[PDB]
Write a protein that binds this ligand. Structure first.
Ligand SMILES: Nc1ncnc2c1ncn2[C@@H]1O[C@H](COP(=O)(O)OP(=O)(O)OP(O)(O)=S)[C@@H](O)[C@H]1O
Ligand SMILES: [Mg+2]
Ligand SMILES: [Zn+2]
Ligand SMILES: [Zn+2]
Lengths: 111, 396, 124, 105, 121
């Protein structure tokens, strides 16, 4: 189970670290108080007002899926608990755990 | 000859004689819309039959005596021919005072007790001192104890040595039974139905349904469910004072999920308020009070004290006051204090059978001692030296 | 320019090789290649056999008071608890035993070659 | 929508906390001496002048505050932009906006 | 093992590190070998993090933040972990089987090493 936040960015504020983030759906709007790691994640991937992004809360994985004023803004709840199911082959487990950054061998041979 | 023991609390007065039992009587006047010209005093509240919409006239604001007329009337009723028939000129009175009592209130207490009633001798102490005396009498081997007095209007945490109170380490938490009852009133009024005029009924509801949760978030998850798995949710039938004299909880087998009942009973449904209200004692910041909870305050008070005495204080945690009667209070306090305490130090939390009357029992015990006459301040000495020596002898 | 490939896997997979410390032995007692460039033949052969600590010396140093301060250069019980102190002295004994065992374990292995041999055999 | 400054939020929080110490919410059914602040100001009580009432107040907790929904009480990931109140669901946000956002109804 | 309640290096360079670990069964104060301070700084260990320290090796693993601090921010990219249940000091006597090949492959290549050649290796 993972917590996924999908919405449209309204306002992003970062000050010298503390920050605030305002996200909205078609049904609700919210302001978040950001931590240092999420501030760094949002700084690394340029996020500005109007972008529609999804955030994986535990990892900070932010992926911009378009801009809205093009993808329609999400409708329901901003924060959703999702059940993610992965089917991983034994070969994939072996290659991932064979060495550091070993998952690259799943794509480039080199096992 | 005889000795009167009084615990002038802001909610209940524990009044009794040293040679007799203890009585719990509300220390406030009452007015109701069912009586045009009639003010009830102290235990007269039993006479009224429709306590809905009851009005409270309190002599204490924020735990300190501020209204003198109502307190005088209550004392006159308690000391009058109807209740106790106290012979003032030949009776010693042990009356408890709030912690850090202001100088003006102390002067008024001394003046009233020594002039308006003319008691033979007065001993003004704190309820924690009497509780510590009782605990030390019960446990002669202990050299130190820490007393948690979670009462109506506050919660102090005071460490006591054998015959001295550590004034430096006294910590007060501004969460008490009054605040919890008012918060429950506000929650119920905002969510289900308006009960802001039902202080008595909501107080009984809090005393009957609330409990301290061992796992807060597991209980929240259980309460958020719907159906059979929501074991926390219960249905309460408020008393209409026509056919249901006192409130009661419907049995689980008789519960209806839909919430509609053919009988016209006014049913109040409480799911998360059962443990959210008691949690304010342990987490004041839940509702907005930026203060440390009971276990953190206990740990802070102990750790302020010298290192040698700390293991003794950790071994003799005593819970007193009305709020300590919540189910699971002792276990929660013990678990949190054990989590915070250094591992080499053993933790023991004791909840007496009757935490309400602990201070009264302590006062009776200190009255029975042969050193009692040295503690009190007499009226003959009051005439000349009294107003200074009352401050000098009493360790308020 | 293309975005990278985001390869998603189960979080449990990344912990497949991970073993809790309480479930695995110390492999540093067999670390021979780690001693190369760090441990010398002198340390293994001459110094440590002579200057290994003993339990008696460790206990004597631990129990003895602090040494007197070094001279400056010159140009020429009511609250006492018996159980708590017994626990504390048992903890101190356990700590000293652990210190001894770890000091013995961390200098037990001798290098295959040693710093001196490698330096001698290494031409410019 | 409108936005409330820090002073307004602090005043609302203080008023709510003070309301919990009120003796009664209604008026006297009969419908026809000091207070705590007067006692404090008469005592002239100064900080760091030994143990006293003010110095006995509990300090800030170490554990951070846990947000709960202002409507139903369950944990609340969301914070209302206008007033800063916490909430947990679209329904709860609508109820809060209708009831206690902006104007205090 | 436990949540870090205090992390104070003691200067004479650093003579030792005093750490405070908390569990459900109490709190323990530990004096650390000064070599562990580098490992603690590399692992980015702060107060409120749940860590474990190996007594024999000084290895430090920061296994997330304590869930009591989960509400300190509304959105941080942190992994919040429950407070450990048992004692701070955990002892286990174990019997593990290894083969000679495991020791051979363990001594075939070096491990760790802060040098440039080791990192590139
Ligand atoms: N069974 C119970 N469960 C929960 N709360 C209870 C119970 N019985 C009494 N109380 C509460 O106990 C409080 C009164 O406790 P007391 O300590 O006796 O008050 P008090 O000591 O007279 O006033 P203070 O605080 O000393 S000035 C009230 O707020 C009651 O609601
Ligand atoms: Mg009391
Ligand atoms: Zn809600
Ligand atoms: Zn709002």
């Amino acid at each position: 189970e993972t917590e996924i936040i999908e919405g449209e960015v309204v306002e992003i504020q970062i000050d010298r670290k503390v920050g605030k983030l305002t996200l909205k759906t078609t049904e609700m709007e919210t302001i978040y108080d950001l931590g240092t790691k999420m501030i760094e994640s949002l700084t690394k991937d340029k996020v500005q007002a109007g972008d529609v992004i999804t955030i994986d809360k535990a990892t900070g994985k932010i992926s911009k899926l378009g801009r809205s004023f093009f993808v329609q803004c999400p409708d329901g709840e901003l924060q959703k608990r999702k059940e993610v199911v992965h089917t991983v082959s034994l070969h994939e487990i072996d290659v991932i755990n064979s060495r550091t950054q070993g998952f690259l061998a799943l794509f480039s041979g080199d096992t | 000859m005889t000795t009167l023991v009084l615990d002038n609390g802001a909610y209940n007065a524990k009044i009794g004689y040293s040679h007799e039992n203890v009585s719990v009587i509300p220390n406030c006047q009452f007015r109701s819309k069912t009586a045009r010209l009639k003010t009830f005093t102290a235990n007269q509240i039993d006479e009224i039959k429709d306590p809905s919409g009851l009005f409270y006239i309190l002599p204490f604001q924020k735990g300190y005596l501020v209204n003198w007329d109502v307190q005088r009337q209550v004392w006159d009723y308690l000391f009058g021919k109807e209740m106790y028939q106290v012979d003032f000129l030949d009776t010693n009175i042990i009356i408890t005072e709030p912690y850090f009592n202001f100088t003006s209130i102390q002067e008024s207490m001394n003046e009233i007790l020594f002039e308006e009633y003319q008691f033979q001798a007065v001993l003004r102490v704190n309820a924690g001192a009497l509780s510590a005396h009782r605990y030390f009498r019960d446990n002669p081997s202990e050299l130190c104890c820490i007393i948690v007095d979670s009462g109506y209007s506050f919660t102090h945490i005071v460490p006591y040595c054998r015959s001295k109170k550590k004034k430096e380490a006294i910590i007060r938490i501004n969460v008490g039974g009054k605040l919890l009852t008012n918060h429950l009133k506000e929650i119920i009024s905002y969510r289900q139905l308006h009960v802001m005029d039902e202080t008595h009924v909501i107080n009984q509801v809090k005393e009957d349904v609330c409990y301290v949760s061992q796992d807060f978030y597991r209980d929240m998850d259980i309460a958020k469910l719907k159906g059979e798995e929501n074991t926390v949710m219960i249905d309460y039938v408020l008393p209409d004072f026509s056919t249901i004299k006192k409130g009661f909880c419907k049995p689980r087998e008789e519960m209806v999920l839909s919430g509609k009942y053919k009988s016209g009973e006014q049913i109040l449904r409480l799911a998360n308020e059962r443990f959210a209200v008691p949690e304010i004692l342990f987490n004041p910041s839940d509702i907005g009070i930026q203060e440390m909870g009971i276990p953190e305050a206990i740990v802070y008070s102990i750790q302020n004290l010298p290192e040698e005495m700390q293991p003794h204080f950790f071994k003799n945690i005593v819970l007193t006051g009305g709020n300590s009667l919540f189910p699971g209070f002792r276990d929660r306090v013990y678990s949190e204090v054990r989590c915070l305490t250094p591992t080499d130090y053993d933790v023991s939390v004791v909840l007496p059978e009757n935490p309400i009357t602990y201070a009264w029992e302590g006062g009776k015990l200190i009255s029975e001692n042969d050193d009692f006459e040295d503690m009190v301040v007499t009226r003959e000495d009051y005439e000349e030296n009294g107003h200074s020596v009352c401050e000098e002898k009493f360790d308020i | 320019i293309t975005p990278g490939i985001c390869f998603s896997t189960a979080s449990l997979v990344l912990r497949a090789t991970d073993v809790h410390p309480l479930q695995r032995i110390d492999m540093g007692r067999f670390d021979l290649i780690g001693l190369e460039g760090r441990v010398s033949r002198y340390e293994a052969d001459t110094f440590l056999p002579r200057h290994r600590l003993s339990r008696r010396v460790l206990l004597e140093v631990a129990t003895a008071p602090d040494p007197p301060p070094r001279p400056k250069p010159v140009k020429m019980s009511p609250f006492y608890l018996d159980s708590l102190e017994e626990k504390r002295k048992r903890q101190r004994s356990e700590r000293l035993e652990r210190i001894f065992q770890l000091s013995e374990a961390h200098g037990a292995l001798a290098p295959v070659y040693g710093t001196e041999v490698l330096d001698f055999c290494t031409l410019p | 929508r409108r936005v409330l400054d820090r002073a307004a939020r602090q005043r609302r929080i203080n008023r709510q906390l003070e309301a919990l110490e009120n003796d009664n919410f209604q008026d006297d059914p009969h419908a026809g001496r000091k207070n705590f602040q007067a006692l404090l100001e008469e005592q002239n009580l100064s900080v760091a002048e030994g143990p006293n009432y003010l110095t006995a107040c509990a300090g800030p907790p170490s554990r951070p505050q846990r947000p709960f929904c202002a409507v139903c009480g369950f944990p609340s990931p969301y914070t209302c932009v206008s007033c800063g109140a916490r909430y947990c669901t679209v329904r709860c946000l609508g109820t809060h906006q209708e009831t206690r956002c902006l104007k205090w109804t | 093992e436990g949540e870090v309640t205090e992390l104070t290096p003691c200067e004479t360079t650093i003579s030792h590190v005093i750490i405070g670990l908390k569990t459900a069964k109490g709190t323990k104060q530990l004096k650390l070998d000064p070599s562990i301070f580098e490992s603690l700084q590399k692992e980015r260990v702060e107060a409120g993090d749940v860590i474990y320290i190996e007594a024999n090796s000084g290895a430090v693993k920061r296994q997330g933040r304590c869930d009591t601090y989960a509400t300190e921010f509304d959105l941080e990219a942190e992994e919040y972990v429950p407070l450990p249940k048992g004692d701070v000091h955990k002892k286990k006597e174990i019997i593990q089987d290894v083969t000679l090949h495991d020791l051979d492959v363990a001594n075939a290549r070096p491990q760790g090493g802060q040098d440039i050649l080791s990192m590139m290796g």
